Design a binder for these strands. Sequence first.
DNA 1: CACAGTGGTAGTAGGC
DNA 2: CACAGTGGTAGT
DNA 3: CAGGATAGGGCTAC
DNA 4: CAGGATAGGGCTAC
DNA 5: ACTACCACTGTGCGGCGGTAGCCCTATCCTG
DNA 6: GCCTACTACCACTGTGCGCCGGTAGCCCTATCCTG
Lengths: 345, 344, 550, 548
Amino acid sequence: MALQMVTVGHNIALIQPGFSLMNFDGQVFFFGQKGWPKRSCPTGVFHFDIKQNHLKLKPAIFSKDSCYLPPLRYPATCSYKKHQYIIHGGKTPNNELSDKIYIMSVACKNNKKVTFRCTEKDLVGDVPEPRYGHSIDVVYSRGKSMGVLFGGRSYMPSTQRTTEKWNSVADCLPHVFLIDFEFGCATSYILPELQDGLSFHVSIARNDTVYILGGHSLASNIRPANLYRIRVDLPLGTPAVNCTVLPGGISVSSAILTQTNNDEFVIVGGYQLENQKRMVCSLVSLGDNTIEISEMETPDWTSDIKHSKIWFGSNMGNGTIFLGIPGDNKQAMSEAFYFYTLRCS
Amino acid sequence: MALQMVTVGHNIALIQPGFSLMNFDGQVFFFGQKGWPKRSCPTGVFHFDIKQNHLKLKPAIFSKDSCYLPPLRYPATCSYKKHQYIIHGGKTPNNELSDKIYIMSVACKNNKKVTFRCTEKDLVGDVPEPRYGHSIDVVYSRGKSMGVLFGGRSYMPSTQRTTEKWNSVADCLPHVFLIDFEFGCATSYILPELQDGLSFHVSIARNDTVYILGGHSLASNIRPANLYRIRVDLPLGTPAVNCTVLPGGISVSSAILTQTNNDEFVIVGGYQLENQKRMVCSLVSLGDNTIEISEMETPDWTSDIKHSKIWFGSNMGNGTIFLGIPGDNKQAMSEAFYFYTLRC
Amino acid sequence: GSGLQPAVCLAIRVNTFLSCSQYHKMYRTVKAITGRQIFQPLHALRNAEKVLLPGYHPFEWQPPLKNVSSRTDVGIIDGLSGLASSVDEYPVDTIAKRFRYDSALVSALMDMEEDILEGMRSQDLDDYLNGPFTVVVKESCDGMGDVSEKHGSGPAVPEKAVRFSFTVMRITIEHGSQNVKVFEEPKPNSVLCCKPLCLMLADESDHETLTAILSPLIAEREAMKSSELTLEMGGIPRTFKFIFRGTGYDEKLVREVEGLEASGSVYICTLCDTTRLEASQNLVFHSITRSHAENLQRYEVWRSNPYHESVEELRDRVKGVSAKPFIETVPSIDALHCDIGNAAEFYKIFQLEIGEVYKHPNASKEERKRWQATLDKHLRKRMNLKPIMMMNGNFARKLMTQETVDAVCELIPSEERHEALRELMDLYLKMKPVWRSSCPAKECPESLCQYSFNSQRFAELLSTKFKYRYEGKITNYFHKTLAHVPEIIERDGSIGAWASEGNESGNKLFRRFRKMNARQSKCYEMEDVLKHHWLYTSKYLQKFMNAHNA
Amino acid sequence: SGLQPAVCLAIRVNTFLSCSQYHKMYRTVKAITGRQIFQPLHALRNAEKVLLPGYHPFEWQPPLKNVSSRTDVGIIDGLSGLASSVDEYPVDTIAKRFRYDSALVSALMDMEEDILEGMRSQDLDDYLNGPFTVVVKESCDGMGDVSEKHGSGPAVPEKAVRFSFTVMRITIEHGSQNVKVFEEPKPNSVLCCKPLCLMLADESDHETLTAILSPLIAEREAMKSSELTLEMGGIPRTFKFIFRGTGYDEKLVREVEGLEASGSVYICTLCDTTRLEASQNLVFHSITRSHAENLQRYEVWRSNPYHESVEELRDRVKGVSAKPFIETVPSIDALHCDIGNAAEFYKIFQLEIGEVYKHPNASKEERKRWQATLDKHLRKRMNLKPIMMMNGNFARKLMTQETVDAVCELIPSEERHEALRELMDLYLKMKPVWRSSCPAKECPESLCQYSFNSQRFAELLSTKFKYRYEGKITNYFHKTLAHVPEIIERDGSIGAWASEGNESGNKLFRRFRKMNARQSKCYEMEDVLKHHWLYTSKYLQKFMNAHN
DNA sequence: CACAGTGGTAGTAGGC
DNA sequence: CACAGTGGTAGT
DNA sequence: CAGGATAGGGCTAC
DNA sequence: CAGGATAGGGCTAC
DNA sequence: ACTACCACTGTGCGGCGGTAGCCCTATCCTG
DNA sequence: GCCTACTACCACTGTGCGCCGGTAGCCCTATCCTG
Ligand SMILES: [Mg+2]
Ligand SMILES: [Mg+2]
Ligand SMILES: [Mg+2]
Ligand SMILES: [Zn+2]
Ligand SMILES: [Zn+2]
């Protein structure tokens, strides 16, 4: 609702569609920089610091025990209880997909400068695929946690991939992989209500159910206004999963989620369809096992945004959404992206 | 000898080969600007005020009684009796030559600035054909005074001139026009001593005589090491002129004459050969009938200069010499010329 | 020799831009594949050029041209014109190569000889006539840039060129009755018609160099103004009067050469002696007065100051003529640069309306930049116009469209501004055909008939709804478009016909040749470019290439 | 009728004639001679099909990994199905490529005549369907200043990336003998840098660049693992392929080989050495870096199995932080070697004119004065003008004892004259080695002496020019001095393997995009690639060399 | 040592 | 209303 | 009071 | 203390 | 075999050292 | 001895580095002296 044009002097060219913000210690951190990690930030992770509507991508050190992960575009970023983000999939700057999970915790913090521990979890079992545009989001069933991974784009299987369509993406078979990072044992779940591969679908995990809103199904090339609630059971034994396509779903893709308040998220629009982007936010109130997709007072969108063709961004983390739109003055050196921040009360 | 570079902000683009500097009571003024007078300085004349080795071409202005003369390249500039710089000839930015004489006085100095009364002194009689590279120089004889205009390249006569060679110049037939700026009458005085026409000769005006010195005769395309002395008596009626080919002259051209002290003039810069400049300055001691061109000590010529194919400049009038050379056109509008100042 | 004649092989080498090297590749390839000389070798093509280049066709000027050599064999002479490139003289950073304007015109006529006779026939006249023609010649000078100085021996020429080029626009012979157009360049702004006359490696702003190089051409022009050309064509000793019309100049260049202050001057037109203020107030009722004769009289007034007026009173007396004109330009409008400047001002207007500066006069530089970027992104989205740094004519005539205004309106949250912009552009498009037509008397007489009224509406619209940006500050080209175009049409019959669009379009060819049809040496680039650009403009070769229709 | 369509096409492309200008010439010749001497545009277009990829049948004994077997694909989209959805990563790209399979078979069937003539010339047969170990010099090259066009299309950068390949050397097996069937006589000829992908992108855009190129890289990797049964002269001949990625500028090499930028303290794309460890040793550097080694090092960086800090880890991987995308061969861009070494000698002249060997601390504006002085004197003496972006022609008129003789006219110190003249003498006894397409033949003296000439150049750089090359040696000085001999032993040449052919093909890219292409973002790349394939067609070049 | 021009002379093969 | 391409495709 | 960011400039390649 | 230079920016053309 | 059509191009402005990155050090900027 | 074809030869080109609003000028006003 509260829009303000953020300025990015240096390292703005690193912010690329597909970047992921991660809220550690309340300090917000950028990841998924353009190109590969430059020695100004060999890690690719940056202190995201907006001060007086000016953003400063302050390089962020990693740990000794850390796995220096690549800049992943459109990966699956979720969070935890010290507070460790989970980054699955994503397009490496080499436009090859990651199958690794990157558990980016914080190893320590001093003078506001953080050293992360971006360890690498490899997934035994039904490791989903190298994919992107998907949603990883964690559930807490019986206190035990589990990362629900719902599909996003991938590159065709090697047997089927061809260089004339090398970058052709297929929405992964819509499954639900249960990543138990205690063992990294992914567990696929073929849900019959999930029969249309999805991607760029905002997934809101509340306690034990993840609400898949929006998404783009290139299989149908349409953005289904679907509200798949994937409820998860992790009792003593049988890890079970049941999805239910609730009503009230919204047609969005690449939308940006933020937990403005407790169980009160805000999906500031992504795209209603390719050249019709959702210039209307969508409040999402989550009862313990109910969810209503309201429609906020659409912010005073700047013409630069309304008249844009694309827009990207991610959850600063508290109630704010960092947005970017192609500036296209000359998109050569100066400012290839006009960036904004969108607070929510 | 005190070669110190000069920095110039805007208006550097106005200083060009052919510019003249007029020293009105210590205030030096630049006149011949590149292109026509822009509405920044519609007069074309400037204050050539250097300060901390940085030159500020401060747009001067003319008076109401004036004549907004054109930016004349390689004109004949000469002080005068007050102190009205005569300016004859010169290539207007249209390449045209100005037969007009422009007498630049200084009419107002209430302000810190000046205000020139550039009058047009129309010429009568054996007027000099439109020319440039020549030398007007005032000789004061028996009290009476006359400007001695000699030499200068000029465009071929309107009959012999052709468009295949429209700008082809010929050194004006060597004559010494005597000009009474009190009446604006030129008096051509063809002299057998001056066989070859000259241009870009320095010329030292002393009482009743003028030492023509070190020109370029386009006819022979050679710079004669001649030192013609043109003595000018003024018996009422028709004045009596007579030249004298003195020896010891230096084969130079486009050199800058600068009165360091009285009766002594340094001849800095110029060219000995089209491909070889005159890196060696030359003091010139003068008597009423004496002259001795003593080869000065070579200044600390920077490689910026020594290696420049050309150079140009003019006498700031206080024993000082403003000296420009083609700068590096690494770009188009980088810097017109690198400038320098010599004190002597 | 069942192949082609050398002149046709030359027309091919030329209009197909084939370099002599690539043409030789082709010629030897066909001669080694087929065996027969389909194409003529290069020596033959050069012997043919000798015919199409100036310095071949004999001619006479009944009053011999003053200060012009009577020699009819001079072709690509040095543009310096004996300018002493000496160390004592003014430096010469100029590779100038020019045709002698009389030789050049002779070759241009004898080149269209067939076309002149074609018209004399089609005009119910006798193609054996020798009556006094009247060749109207649009001399068109224009400065060019990014002319990469070459390495090698030669002056340190600037990375700038000047292309003087005369376009033989129309030839009219008087058959007693009236001057009938035995020829009219159908495509006058074409690159095939603006025949080069002088390629300088100079800057059009370098008045010293420019004038050193052009005063020859100007002398030849002022001479041909006062002399018939009894050159023989069609076997008959035709005789031509020349009406040179220097209209293919950029306004910047006109002001350089007609002795006027830069475009930003308070004195705004090269046609009327009015001020930017009086031009933002009246905007229409301004009569052409600025003429080369008047500009010279006014420069002599300035120089002389016969009334001893201050620089302000004086500058007003002379109405901006501080400098001496050395080119008799006819007071007209570079339709190319009128369109470019008017589209630049409409681009600015769009920026401003996006900023609603009619409400918010004050405005941030970065916010004006933001409006510019918004407009850029939109025109790219809707009108598919990439954001260009330096406004061109194509971007313009794609921007001077009701469609571009429809797009811009999407960014103007003000329907009254929508209507203001749409009416402004409606008027500008009901006027642009007039000063942009090669012949509005027929191309758009519906508009010309109503041009004065449409421009009155445009002016009062700038004063009503674009009150901003146009109170005491109207662009030079707006003033020309509104005030003079009707008079320019009553005088010359057209404006687009009389634009530098041909010269400029030929700058493209200058580059094309300098890179692909010239010896890459400062000594020979201008000579060769001039040769080949002349050939390109030769209606003989263009005919031989139009033989698929002929 | 004497002109076959292929010959009129050769005339059209090699004479750079546009289809419009060729049509003018054709209709004119046909209206003049009456004879339809030139075959019409449609006939040339039907002939192109034979020369463009996607015409000649073929098969790879091991069918290629993730490459369609279709022998009927030509100018496909370089996007490669890259989803331009707004959800995905934008595509500021107009990419058009040949499928490297089809491109290579078209190059071979275009050199069919050349290959057969060369095997005849080598005591060999035409009944010899033996495995020709083709050697393909890959040359990717960012162009820049590519004026983008108005009209419908993605907001591409004013840049390009011309991936190309020069079939440098086809060698066949003859018992144990490896016979050089055909060897590109003009390696860096723009007539042989077969364009393979023209993408209106920016090599700096690793995401876009890689999206466009990784299909080519996959085809290349699969060809490295297979054998091409192509029917030449009516015989099915097998072609093994060896791709040497060498026409990459060091900036692009480092982009695509996972390496830090040129300014990195890790100074080479060949050795793991350091900008400092190379300003001291300067000659003795085994070529260590290899795309395989660089992948190992990238996954070592990523994983950090030894749990090292960023500095220790970086020094363990030696700058391989990014993932190597292209299997670049650890070689030198003789062109950019000349450009960089000559810009270095240019700075050297600027500094000797500044005598910074005595006055290390000098004013920025004084260094500008020195640049200006050298500019003026080189324009005067060496006649070569001051250029902003150093080029190779400058680097050849400047890397000349004539030029240092001219410079010495600007330095007072005669010992500096001796130093500069010896430096240039060594650089000019070294350059022939990494410019000559085969120094073993063109300059074997300079090659067998290259070790010593390089030791001397290095010791003189350390001694006389220590004001610039103590602890900081340029990357191309370290390549020239330390790696050239090993590359010659390995590659047999360097200039043969430069981006000079690709870069010169940038000239044709512009010439076509301006003259021989539909001026529309939808087709500029397609048409330029078509016509720059043709131009590079040895078939058409032969037809144009019939007079010889 | 890049290379394919860039085109106008000049010189050199041929014809007659 | 610049105009001559720019080349493939579709349509005569 | 020294530690850390940091802006700038020199340096490498394009 | 107001007059004059003057630097800067807006404006015109290229 | 022609020719139209499409949906645009370059010529129309100019300058100037630039990026990107890297790496080291002179500021600066704390607490 | 003519002409016609062919080719060397000159000394260089561009393609190799981007980036951006720029210059020149005008002129009108906010800075800034200027004691
Ligand atoms: Mg102009
Ligand atoms: Mg590159
Ligand atoms: Mg390149
Ligand atoms: Zn007017
Ligand atoms: Zn190395």
